[PDB]
From TrEMBL, chain A:
Domain spans labelled Tubulin/FtsZ 2-layer sandwich: 246-383
Pfam families given in the database record: Tubulin, Tubulin_C
Natural source organism: Sus scrofa (Pig)
Entry-linked PROSITE patterns: TUBULIN, TUBULIN_B_AUTOREG
Localization in the cell: Cytoplasm, Cytoskeleton
GO biological process: microtubule-based process
Residues annotated to bind GDP 1: Q11, C12, N99, S138, G141, G142, T143, G144, V175, E181, N204, Y222, N226
Superkingdom of the organism of origin: Eukaryota
Domain Tubulin/FtsZ GTPase residue range list: 47-244
Transmembrane stretches, start-end: none
A GO MF term: metal ion binding
Swiss-Prot/TrEMBL keywords: Cytoplasm, Cytoskeleton, GTP-binding, Isopeptide bond, Magnesium, Metal-binding, Methylation, Microtubule, Nucleotide-binding, Ubl conjugation
Name of the protein: Tubulin beta chain
Amino acid sequence: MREIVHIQAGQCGNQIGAKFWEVISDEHGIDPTGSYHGDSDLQLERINVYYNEATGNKYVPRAILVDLEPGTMDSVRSGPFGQIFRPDNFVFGQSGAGNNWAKGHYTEGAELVDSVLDVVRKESESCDCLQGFQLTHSLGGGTGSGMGTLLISKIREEYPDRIMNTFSVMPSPKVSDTVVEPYNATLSVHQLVENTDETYCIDNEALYDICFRTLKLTTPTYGDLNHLVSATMSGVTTCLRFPGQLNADLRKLAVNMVPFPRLHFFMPGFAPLTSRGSQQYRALTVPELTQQMFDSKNMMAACDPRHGRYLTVAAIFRGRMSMKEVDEQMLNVQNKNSSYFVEWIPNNVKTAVCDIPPRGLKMSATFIGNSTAIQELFKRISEQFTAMFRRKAFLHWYTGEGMDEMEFTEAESNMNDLVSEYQQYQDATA
Amino acid sequence: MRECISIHVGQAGVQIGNACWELYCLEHGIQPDGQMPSDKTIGGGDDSFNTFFSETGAGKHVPRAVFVDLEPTVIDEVRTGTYRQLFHPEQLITGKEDAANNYARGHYTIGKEIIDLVLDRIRKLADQCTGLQGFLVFHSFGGGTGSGFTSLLMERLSVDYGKKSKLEFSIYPAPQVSTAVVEPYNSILTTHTTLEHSDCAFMVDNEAIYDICRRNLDIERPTYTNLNRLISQIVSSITASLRFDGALNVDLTEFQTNLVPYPRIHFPLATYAPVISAEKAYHEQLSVAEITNACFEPANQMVKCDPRHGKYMACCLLYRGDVVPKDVNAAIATIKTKRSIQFVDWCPTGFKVGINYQPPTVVPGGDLAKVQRAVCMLSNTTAIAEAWARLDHKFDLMYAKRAFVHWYVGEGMEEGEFSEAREDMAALEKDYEEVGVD
Amino acid sequence: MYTFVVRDENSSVYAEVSRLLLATGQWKRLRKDNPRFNLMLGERNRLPFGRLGHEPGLVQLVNYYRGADKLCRKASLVKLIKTSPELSESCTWFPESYVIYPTNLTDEREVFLAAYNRRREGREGNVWIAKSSEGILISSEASELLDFIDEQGQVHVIQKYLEKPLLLEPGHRKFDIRSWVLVDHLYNIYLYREGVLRTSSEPYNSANFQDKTCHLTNHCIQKEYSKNYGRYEEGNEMFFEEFNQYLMDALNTTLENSILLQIKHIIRSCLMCIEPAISTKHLHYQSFQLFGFDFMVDEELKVWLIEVNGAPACAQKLYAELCQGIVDVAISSVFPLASIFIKLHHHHHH
Amino acid sequence: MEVIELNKCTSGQSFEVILKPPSDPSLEEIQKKLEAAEERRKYQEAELLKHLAE
Ligand SMILES: CCC1=C[C@@H]2CN(C1)Cc1c([nH]c3ccccc13)[C@@](C(=O)OC)(c1cc3c(cc1OC)N(C)[C@@H]1[C@@](O)(C(=O)OC)[C@H](OC(C)=O)[C@]4(CC)C=CCN5CC[C@]31[C@@H]54)C2
Ligand SMILES: Nc1nc2c(ncn2[C@@H]2O[C@H](COP(=O)(O)OP(=O)(O)OP(=O)(O)O)[C@@H](O)[C@H]2O)c(=O)[nH]1
Ligand SMILES: Nc1nc2c(ncn2[C@@H]2O[C@H](COP(=O)(O)OP(=O)(O)O)[C@@H](O)[C@H]2O)c(=O)[nH]1
Ligand SMILES: [Ca+2]
Ligand SMILES: [Ca+2]
Ligand SMILES: [Ca+2]
Ligand SMILES: [Cl-]
Ligand SMILES: [Mg+2]
Ligand SMILES: [Mg+2]
Ligand SMILES: [Mg+2]
């Protein structure tokens, strides 16, 4: 289990997907040309997880760029690293999806999905040992949302024995004002709970709050938000890209993180939270990393950890530090807040340390929590969904593409069931 | 002379195997390229060290070892490491993707695609044996390969080598270094399916080794390297009698004879003294009496447990260094008047003692100091069942909620195997309590 | 913030210890199966000693000593005294006792009678009592209580009933002494300076021996089949201040000289005997335990140990002082926050 | 405390000290269990591939 195939879909999926590739290219010492120019050799040790080696020691990201409209990836070309991608891996249509899940899933996206699967096949065939897929998309629009989940469904049919992982951006009214985004997200969650193994819940609500209140950015942009997303995507994939013991491939992460198949929606956290311009002058201490990464203000999903219980936790420390201290502080958190870690999963927190830090930090920490409190996020989407659906408002945009009402009430039921299953384990005891 | 084959399964079995075989070479004066100047029968021989090493006409001494991992990266550094010319390429068997910490993945799913290959390469070693005694099997309880492939191999080895003995060295899981939440699941699954196929298993609780390295080697955060070199010392003390001239435990059957009166109760506790830091500037060498007494301190056991509150069924003292019997029996006389040592009624209160004059060989640049005398005690006490109760409690907690169980059902395993395995363990806990408690 | 779990909700003493720890603002009670505890106040039966001391990052303490039942169950005690060289059969403070199994299911029954008829050979006082680990019977013939044991289905002990006890006047009545001893994790032995005399309210009668209330000093049988319960002393409990004054006024001695010396001697002897079997000095977890020693004083002011109880209750006006001493001495010694005991130690040279 | 069966050699000694006298399934069944679980895998997979075909 080595190679991961990466897919980014829609506007958000390509934007955050592009910044991820910029960030981890730097960490591994690959430049826009695709050449290695790095100092350490930890950088190349597992570079084949995400990159294909090519012509004369050129590295090509094993990345597929999907959108139903072109300006998305004309903009990725224009980007810092735009020329590093394999040009035949740019798959795009002309019509857009009009923030319409149905157009992404059933009509416009159906027209384009087969040619995406051809690039997927050509990339999957060339893999010594494919471990599975990661998709970046938002859940509030049409392409990454509806065509993203159409893709996931078709990849699973063709590769049923491989891991499916998503980075899924949750919509929030603090950031966007399109009314139908709760419809699109609810239909999307329905797919995700059935066809992904692990989903990182990247809440725009939590991203907004972090940027607005904590970093005091009073006019937040998507660049401010995506700065927190690439730091998080970097942190959570550290264990896949560098040598190490814990959660070092997608499946072992899934076995450690997912006690029940449907409860595979993770709450990510990061410390220290930093602005794009900001160039902080003091490294954090290990006790500081530790308390910040668990602090509710550092979560990438707008959920209160103290309102639920942690089923499983993965923690990743990066930089040069005492492994003894990291151990001591991690043990401190559990023993000082033992109530918040379910007792019927012994030792459910696992800790990894990697010595290569992120660009611009000496010390950083990434949190991945499987907490029952993520139900608050699904509850928020669910309330916005039913406020419109009980009057069937704005449904014609969807029935006009062939969808029936029943499909909406089924997605709504599956999501309320998931919230219900989280409550179940929140109330379970030994 | 009768040969022993070592089988190293998974990361833990392989890395510990690297540690032992390195230690074996230093103890026998075998060089990294397999040349052994002191061996004067060239290209052959039947000395005691040929138990573990075969010979080539070129003078190469080759471990009777198979290394097996379902993924390649660990055995790859064996293919490229300091002892690369020691092992034949056909001894090092790798797959492509591992068991993902899943017993069922390594037993049923991936094991099936590699089991016959391993058996064939074990046969090729067996064909080189004029009189094979059996096998020493190194593996973790907690990984998917270490638990799940091992128990499949232990079933087939009983089929193909029905009268050969099989001994395990087993790494019992500890959260300070464990890598997966389901390690209690895998441990019980592999203990249940291996129980009947293992004559005598030496359990090493990673928690116990980890705290010995911390307390006595002054290692802040012990690595596997730290742990494996200490385990290798203990493994070497236990196998010294197969590899050197002596009269105690000279073949694999004597381990069972001397340590295992009851077949299911086949987990001797191992205790080792002394463990001394190499960077400890000034050090006062410990006497026979002092190291023998340390054999009865739980802080020196391979498994934390309290043998005061159980019963003994057999005890073996394995000395290395400047030890003579007179000092052993004085040390033993003093110790029994001071400590709680109660044997089961149907057994004699007594010790089997073995002395080897060469003191322990330390790896140069390791953490262990050279000492003049050392001892490894092998005691079959019922107290070790405490470790079973710990594992079983963790299991019950998780299984009651069926947590992670779908990962195993997903691989073809039935939910009933969980509860068959768990009631085998419940029977085992009750066997121990009948023997060791009134 | 220290953590603790409670697993013995029927314990008066540790109910009060739990309450005191909370009131410190520095102890949080977890729920009984949370493993991440500093302190376990454990159950009486099958305390899971095998699971303590395997939590990284937590010093763990428990309020019972594994193995201490060999002091605290009556058949075990007899076998302990008879077989341990430092206690011995040459032991002046334990009554002649014999462990006897029902015929129904080693045993000393026929070694019992050799001394019994030794007492009959000179027709010495040959009265004995048999008890279990209400539920008792005193006789003068082996046959009645011998069969009494077979009439029940578990091992019993038969021990010399002390025919000439010390009786307090006014009342000509029996009593026993309960002593509360705390053994900490360092195996320091702390005698609680307050003891109690559980007294009889009825005159001792030598002539007829199944008058259970005049012979059985136990608190339960006194406030039942006695009808003078509480006349002489409040709750049939005499305390040391009072009993000391009776000793000075009536006997011209003190409590310390005539009785406590022997009591301290017996407590240390018993507890140092078992120390190598139960000490937790180099263990991965640590233990402390409160014990209740029960003594009888005969007419010549000789003290006898009648038994040791591993889960004692306290006297009601004493609960507050004792359990606070527990927190001070046994708990906060290991878990410092932000005497009422006499330490029992003696190092004679020879 | 008796010392028994003492053996000496140039490498060392061994002996016994006594303080107190006394007071498998076939190649066939195995393969039958690997195939049974394998078909349980393929059934679970077929049901998924059926569901996805719907
Ligand atoms: C991450 C990318 C992004 C962030 C967000 C929206 N966009 C895209 C740019 C953007 C901002 N503004 C605009 C005015 C005209 C054109 C574009 C913009 C904004 C900004 O930088 O502003 C200075 C911003 C916007 C809002 C916002 C906060 C906010 O940044 C503090 N909310 C919570 C809005 C409100 O709905 C609301 O509830 O606030 C009480 C808001 O109504 C009011 C009374 O402000 C208001 C204000 C237009 C009205 C209704 C619905 N939308 C969405 C959220 C909300 C906004 C930043
Ligand atoms: N003492 C010691 N323990 C180890 C070592 N390697 C792994 N372990 C322990 O073994 C358990 C993990 O199992 P592994 O040996 O890594 O697993 P594996 O056999 O490779 O199986 P999979 O990777 O799941 O296919 C954990 O409890 C580890 O702490 C080692 O080198 N020394
Ligand atoms: N965090 C983040 N969210 C985005 C970005 N771009 C769009 N979104 C969000 O994604 C949703 C819109 O979906 P979008 O990706 O634009 O539509 P698509 O092109 O049809 O897939 C809204 O909830 C937006 O707030 C981005 O760059 N970062
Ligand atoms: Ca069209
Ligand atoms: Ca030779
Ligand atoms: Ca067999
Ligand atoms: Cl055979
Ligand atoms: Mg858009
Ligand atoms: Mg086609
Ligand atoms: Mg492995």
